[PDB]
Structure formats: C-alpha cells, structure tokens
C-alpha cells in the first residue's frame, strides 16, 4: 500500500568518500630529524676534524 | 708539528679529464670498397652469363 525504500531501487545511488583514507602518511624518522644532503653520484667523501 | 698532505685528508679533491676518452670510429672496408646496393626487400635475382 506504500513505496518503500528497496522499491525505487537504483533511483537511490550509493555515496563515496575518502575522509578515513585522507593523507596522515608517515614519513621516515631520519629524514625529518637529521640534514639531508643532496648527492650527486654514488659516493661523496666528507673530511671531519681529527686534531 | 705540521700538516702533511695525508693529515688534510679528503679536503683536497680529486680531478677529472676527459682528454684521453675518445677514439674514431672505424667504418666498414666492404661498405667503402664495393658498391652499395639499395635493398627493398630481403632477396635480389641478378642473372649472369654462364656458357
């Protein structure tokens, strides 16, 4: 005697959305806490005091 | 009592000179001897006085 809901079926669309996928990616630890020095080629000597 | 070259460690740099990396080329000796024929396709036919 009455339209229900699972009655219009398809005429009501399932939602989307991503706010529990959303960006809170960890980044490394030692990158952010310690210099990152750019290099160009496989190895670079650095000279540290000694006396 | 003083710094020798060893004691300055990797404060003095290496150097690099490309004067001794290059050669030419050699070419085919067939390729400037004989004639070079133009191929369109994987066989040529010449025929030949044969008797």
Same mark, same amino acid.
């Not at 699972?6 to 490394?28: D, M, P």
């Given at each position: 005697a009455?339209?229900?809901?699972? +009655?219009?079926? #398809? $005429?009501? +669309? +399932? @939602?989307? %959305?991503?706010? $529990? $996928?959303?960006?809170?990616?960890? @980044?490394? #630890?030692?990158? %952010?806490?310690?210099q990152?020095?750019?290099? @160009?080629t496989?190895t670079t000597h $650095?000279p540290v005091l000694? #006396?």
């Amino acid at each position: 005697a009455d339209i229900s809901r699972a +009655e219009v079926a #398809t $005429l009501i +669309e +399932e @939602g989307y %959305s991503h706010s $529990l $996928l959303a960006a809170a990616k960890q @980044g490394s #630890t030692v990158l %952010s806490a310690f210099q990152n020095v750019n290099m @160009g080629t496989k190895t670079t000597h $650095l000279p540290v005091l000694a #006396t």
